[PDB]
Symmetry: C3
Subunit: 438 residues, 3 copies
């Protein structure tokens, strides 16, 4: 009946090597489903079920058939980041130490496709289609030394990937997953009509990367947190991408990063970063809608990462655009920084920066900037919650919109006062937000 359970397969042992088990199942599917056109069918695929459990993967799973679903019964997330920064003598008193759910422990050596627990690859025609990953946990266990000289467990470096799709694909789904302690959670090349929906992708170096090219895809309703040298959501050479209803929290280098992305929408997300450069439209990213997002940029409050950042200064912008004919409408920006820590020394922080391109429409954006002392404490979630709720601050001067001379013929409306909008009025259409009074 094309239904498998990894705990009820005679070949191998999913505790020891679930990779071998799953590959054996896939070989069985292929052996049974050899003919493509028998009574209007023949290759319907299969479902592989992972009950809740701790499964070591020592052999990469190769998925090269369409319509394979791999499903579990728990996303299994717990903060290994918190646990590895608890003093080791206290570990025996903790209720648990590791992630759980339907848990795939990635025990591969470092790559980068070779370090992927699941590799989806098939060449030829048609494109591999409608593979589904649902409601299981992929755990890379540890981060290791890399010459950054953070403590090993804080480097976000292990060469491991959760799911890597190498080949052109159509109608794929990744839903309800948990990813933790992977250098790369989810990397999908050459995607068409993909949906990445309602996952929990956190404490990974990079979370979601859509590479090569793609079209007509969506990234929706995810909880996402990356590492300071990595991407939270990245896409390149995608057209018609929809990124919406995500809650992106620290500490990726950025929240959303586009290279050559066109005719797409980044709308209605909540985005929180500890560094500038939250949303980056780069390399001729054009005709995109960036609307009704909530941006917060503030200072890392947790001691283990307090001095760690992404190398970008406060002139970068929270939103940076290099490309034509984009639409930036109805966003909220909260810039909550220690004025003494602003870089370069004596700079006015920038919120929206247009570095290149023409015809960008920036309207009806509210910028709120305040000066607060940067505080540091060891207790992660208490420090995080307190910092979000603290509104004890002085108003801070900011540049709401900076139009560099290399970007022209833009339209900037109701997104700051005249002093807050730094731009050449002769070659841009600028309407300052109305001033208080008569």
């Amino acid at each position: 009946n094309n239904r498998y359970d990894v705990t009820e397969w005679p070949a191998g042992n999913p505790a020891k090597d679930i990779g071998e088990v799953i590959n054996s199942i896939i070989a069985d599917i292929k052996a049974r489903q050899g003919a493509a056109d028998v009574d209007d069918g023949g290759k319907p695929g299969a479902v592989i079920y992972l009950p809740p459990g701790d499964y070591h993967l020592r052999t990469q799973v190769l998925i090269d058939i369409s319509f394979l679903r791999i499903e579990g019964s728990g996303h299994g997330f717990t903060s290994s980041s918190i646990r590895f920064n608890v003093p080791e003598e206290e570990w025996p008193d903790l209720h648990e130490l590791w992630p759980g759910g339907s848990r795939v422990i990635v025990d591969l050596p470092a790559g980068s496709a070779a370090g992927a627990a699941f590799l989806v690859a098939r060449e030829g025609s048609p494109r591999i289609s409608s593979v589904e990953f649902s409601n299981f946990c992929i755990d890379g266990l540890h981060f290791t030394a890399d010459g950054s000289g953070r403590h090993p467990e804080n480097t976000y470096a292990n060469g491991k990937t959760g799911i890597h799709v190498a080949s052109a694909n159509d109608s794929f789904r990744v839903t309800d997953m948990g990813f933790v302690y992977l250098e790369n959670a989810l990397t999908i090349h050459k995607a068409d009509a993909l949906s990445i929906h309602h996952n929990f992708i956190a404490e990974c170096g990079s979370c979601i990367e859509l590479r090569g090219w793609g079209q007509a895809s969506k990234i929706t309703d995810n909880l996402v947190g990356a590492g300071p040298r990595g991407h939270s959501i990245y896409a390149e050479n995608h057209g018609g991408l929809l990124v919406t209803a995500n809650n992106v929290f620290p500490r990726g280098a950025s929240s959303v990063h586009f290279k050559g992305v066109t005719r797409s929408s980044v709308t209605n997300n909540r985005l929180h970063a500890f560094y500038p450069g939250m949303v980056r439209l780069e390399e001729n990213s054009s005709e995109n809608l960036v609307a009704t997002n909530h941006f917060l940029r503030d200072h890392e409050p947790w001691t283990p990462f307090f001095g760690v950042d992404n190398g970008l200064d406060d002139l970068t912008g929270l939103l940076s655009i290099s490309g034509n004919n984009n639409s930036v409408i109805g966003n909220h920006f909260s810039e909550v920084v220690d004025a003494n820590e602003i870089r370069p020394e004596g700079a006015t922080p920038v919120i929206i920066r247009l570095t290149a391109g023409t015809g960008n429409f920036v309207s009806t954006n509210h910028v709120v900037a305040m000066d607060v002392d940067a505080a540091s404490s060891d207790s992660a979630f208490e420090a995080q919650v307190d910092a979000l709720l603290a509104t004890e601050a002085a108003d801070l001067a900011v540049t709401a919109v900076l139009v560099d001379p290399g970007s022209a013929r833009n339209t900037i409306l109701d997104s700051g006062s005249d002093t807050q909008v730094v731009a050449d009025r002769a070659v841009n259409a600028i309407r300052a937000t109305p001033t208080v009074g008569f």
Copy 2:
């Protein structure tokens, strides 16, 4: 063994008579088997408990004190007990069915200490926080509402002291998805939530639906269908930062649609909100730096006879959206105010749509207010009354105050959200641009 249980395949007790006893027995088994936290990089992966479709009485509270527990069913099972209990009792035997169904947990607990009346209590102290508990695709039914001295018929009081799911302890990465809740005084109450997702549920005919209490961070409430009772909350949060509330369809008859106390740096964006009373969206007690964008607000009069004279106590000067806090952003919303002028309270008042009661720096831009003077048509048949009222747009104009800025609020910016007559505010101390008119 494989950590998968089915409540109809347990040796002891009877899930039809007391599923609580059965689930607790299962949890005891899980704990007995999963005693070690660090055996081969695992040891406490949790489990899944499956409820097939069926009618299960719960007489003992379920206590969940382990991480990575999933409780799942095969049907949200909603039917309108409210409609049924307002059908004359002598006609009940002729109806196709009476009760909710699906994978149905009937809450037969006495009133609580409201935690004591919860069918499912999630509580664990110490470290780490309990994490990644999942509730999926089952039905929780409080069966009846009871007399409370309100003067309403007993089944219309929204009172029984029962909760569906109560999370007492700090928690991380919890999920509540695909549920049905019905006839509970409180459907879902979660304290101290971090990175919680309440997604794609059906939460209706409950006194209060979703309450996020204590504090919280980085959570989301998405894609829900929600309807509460006139003394209760539809969506409530307190001391949350970075909450995302989006893509919900909130229908009557909660006291409010969305109610925030001390909520900061959050987004209430792209929801459909329908109320029968003023005070639909309330930002209270220093709720600051929030985005309230591209929501559709409808306020009209209750059309269903059993509740025609029942309300939330608030008059038409309250506002549909009321803000007490700093630096919020109210952008791109639609407000339909559809009321009978003779029913306006107090007598002869001009209804207010957006009210800023306190705070500075609020940015209110590009909001369309539509106000109509209609009749008060009522009907004994619920879905007929409701559908006919939504489709009726036959009406003369009603004068309203689109934006009221109280003297306790100043330094706000109000743009294209009403004509000068429609914006009641001190022009000396706020920045005001009237919507252009002809």
Copy 3:
């Protein structure tokens, strides 16, 4: 069985390969025989779940669903592009890895009727309304399109008289989730819906995808991937109030992306919409008080030879967004109009983006229009040229009319949605603020 769980491959004497319709009807009869009493121990008709493992199932008898709380579920949406495959020369088929859709696949082998041609018919009259039926994560495939006198190749006609799911009766709290629909004249037709959720489906290569007929209220269509055919609807609703349409990625080639007739107090917000024809979003027949916000619209030319000269009959004066109704709100949308200037229809016309044909009090604000001139080009490549065309931004400017107000619409407000030249409207009876120019 006593626990209300059925698997179509385990049904005694049934053969779901030959006729899964007969199997499912037999299962429904079994459920009804066991669940005859509505009110025993506060229950009695909880419904059931029917599971379809991955496999190829022919349906030769229509399934009639006339019970509440029935869930039909599978383990794969199973989509592959039959459109691409049927346009690959037949001599190349042997080298293709697969030829057909898969997953949990229901092949609709019914003759043309339109409810008679539906694989699943949901019908029950009387009281209460049938409630909380759920369809989840399976595939419905109409197999072939057939000759219809249009002169297209048979497999390109989008004509076969088959429906996936047809709900004929008033319904409450229904769900359609995670499905795949392919090669059906009508995917999903739901009459008289209340509090329906159509969420996270893949609905493509169907003549029409989603149609909500009769009337309805308080429903939502969210997070779907949708592509229809040139004579049909992508998303259609009539006489609905309080409908939320959001987070959908609608791609070609429906006659429209979203079509409303008599729809009121609803929201079409935060979708990505791509069409090869004008008339992408149509608000018709007194569609009033709707919010159309922060959508991304792209209109360009079909690149794929088999459909290059096929269209929806509408000229470039139609508008991308057309409104006939009162008091709507069109806020924060992005429109990309990418067409061949030499081939605009009618000859000599200037394309229109937003058209108000009738009605009063429409508020159109803060919309960005981007128009460019690109030559139309045909080729047989079935995804490469589609990706390439989305990514290409290589063009001359094209003059368009951003907002056209016909004399039959008046008392509208048009702000920052075009230059004075781009807004064609009677200034005596409409309030116009031109986008500031440089």
